[PDB]
Design a protein around this nucleic acid. Sequence first.
DNA 1: CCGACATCGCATCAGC
DNA 2: GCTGATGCGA
DNA 3: GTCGG
Length: 326
Amino acid sequence: PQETLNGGITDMLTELANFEKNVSQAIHKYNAYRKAASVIAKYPHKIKSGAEAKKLPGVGTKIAEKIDEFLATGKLRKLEKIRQDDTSSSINFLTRVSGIGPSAARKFVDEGIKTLEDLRKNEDKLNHHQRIGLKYFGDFEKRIPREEMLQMQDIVLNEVKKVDSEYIATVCGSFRRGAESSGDMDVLLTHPSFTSESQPKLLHQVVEQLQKVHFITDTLSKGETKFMGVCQLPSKNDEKEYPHRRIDIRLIPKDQYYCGVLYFTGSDIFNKNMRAHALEKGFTINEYTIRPLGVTGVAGEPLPVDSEKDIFDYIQKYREPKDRSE
DNA sequence: CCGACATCGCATCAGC
DNA sequence: GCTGATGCGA
DNA sequence: GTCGG
Ligand code: NA
Ligand code: NA
């Protein structure tokens, strides 16, 4: 499926999704539009009618009508109208700021605050998260080349091992699956001394070392198990400075680590398929555990898991991250 | 016809 | 001051 | 908005 095959339709649908989420506050309509957009992005034919589209799983009566209008007129009256609406287009736009969701964007626009400039003049009304989102607005919308992720990973695995050589850290997300760029870095962390059935500074000490070497530059949120923040690679000589990047780090108990790694590696499609297959073969897989059902349909104890492969074993053949797109 | 549609950790607000 | 709700991101 | 019990 090439971009311009049905790119007009998927852009329209993604645009409609964003308004549902950010303006109408209708999360289930946002997911419906996104799902319609995904199944269409995949369909290897230029769509000629709404009826043709309606066949796809997640395209219903109203999206088929919208496609027809778009097809015959090259636009959509309702999207054209909302696009030109000052209140709505500003609410939608403010939410591109990390930490500003539908509800904060609504309040800001209510009181006349509509642009990054306006937010700039109003630091007093921004929480800590929002100030950082505003501060790195542009950097946060940049993709991360794989080569930079590898440099980031070097730093993270080096500094973790240097804190305590018994830690295990895995960079997951699409980077682990071999993607060519990434949106952020997601690091999963464990230690032999941390299990479900069981100190509480294991995460702090890693975040602390990454700040000591000045890799982590800012903190969005941090508790005993999850850290969310901002990092940057060292600038190499008088060459231009790297953009600031999003990095999350989570500490997972050892006996849940590999269910964690499998999940946060994905992709999403893969996960759903794999959790289907596992139901079908009699076990339940969430992010934490795998458990047997149950003559109808009672889940018993979490089964021991010691690698990713162990999970495949329980349900029957290890697929490497590379081939986990679907 | 009408309810489901990811799920949870952390930060902060609302209520007492 | 504490407890539960909500907003947010992923 | 779409699906399905
Ligand atoms: Na359909
Ligand atoms: Na936002």
